[PDB]
């Protein structure tokens, strides 16, 4: 799912 | 309390197509809460995150598997399911699938249910 | 990706022991890690997750997580035979999501 570290 | 059903264990043969469906109750699967996903272990080894999908059909893979794994949901039957292509013996694991919650602030995933676990091994 | 470490593999511990297991990020996860309880021929059970909070069906001041960054402990309180298992942490910072290689918790009796 869509991670708020790496969001690219 | 969900429950996660996966297709039962067997062989595959090397450089055929791994094929497994998780079939979800007590629940729907057209949660906007929820991400679904398959998990493996090498037996005796640790656990891999192969992928996960929504139930609107994105999906999410690990890069050391994106190009062999496919995964799908079916929401008219609370299904989903996995495919991995062009297997070795690398592949042969307990496979398990996995709702995926988060705690709020921030997408701080979970894995908060799991299946049983499938042994699938990889042979002539 | 973000490797993650534990420490020790493993360890065997007395009942009624307190027994610390150890986690590290190479790189900083903030609070998005989770811990799983892996017992013989079962799937892992969540533990803990945001690195301090208690799956709500867990007994109170048997487990506790600690930790933020690149640093969380999980600490067993009053170890009891039930729980021998491997214990794993996860991340949920970076995709791919990375498990740590697990501790495994034996008992001295």
């Known amino acids: 799912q869509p991670a708020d570290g790496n969001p690219d | 309390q969900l429950q996660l059903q996966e297709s039962g264990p067997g062989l595959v043969k090397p450089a055929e197509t791994l094929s497994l469906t998780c079939t979800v109750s007590?629940?729907?699967?057209?949660?906007?809460?929820?991400?679904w996903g398959w998990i493996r272990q090498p037996p005796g080894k640790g656990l891999e995150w192969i992928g996960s999908i929504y139930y609107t059909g994105s999906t999410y893979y690990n890069p050391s598997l994106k190009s062999r794994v496919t995964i799908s949901v079916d929401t008219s039957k609370n299904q989903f399911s996995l495919k991995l292509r062009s297997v070795t013996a690398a592949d042969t694991a307990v496979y398990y699938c996995a709702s995926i919650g988060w705690a709020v602030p921030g997408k701080r995933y979970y894995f908060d249910y799991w299946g049983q676990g499938t042994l699938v091994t990889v042979s002539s | 990706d973000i490797q993650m470490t534990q420490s020790p593999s493993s360890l065997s511990a007395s009942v009624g022991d307190r027994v610390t297991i150890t986690c590290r990020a190479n790189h900083s996860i903030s609070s998005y890690l989770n811990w799983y309880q892996q017992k013989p021929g079962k799937a892992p059970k969540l533990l803990i997750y945001?690195?301090?909070?208690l799956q709500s069906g867990v007994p109170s001041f048997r487990f506790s997580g600690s930790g933020s960054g690149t640093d969380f402990t999980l600490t067993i309180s009053s170890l009891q035979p039930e729980d021998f298992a491997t214990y794993y942490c996860?991340?949920?910072?970076?995709?791919?999501?990375?498990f740590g290689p697990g501790t495994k918790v034996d008992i001295k009796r």
């Open positions: 007590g629940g729907s699967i057209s949660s906007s809460s929820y991400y």
């Open positions: 945001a690195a301090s909070s």
């Open positions: 996860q991340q949920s910072y970076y995709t791919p999501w990375t």
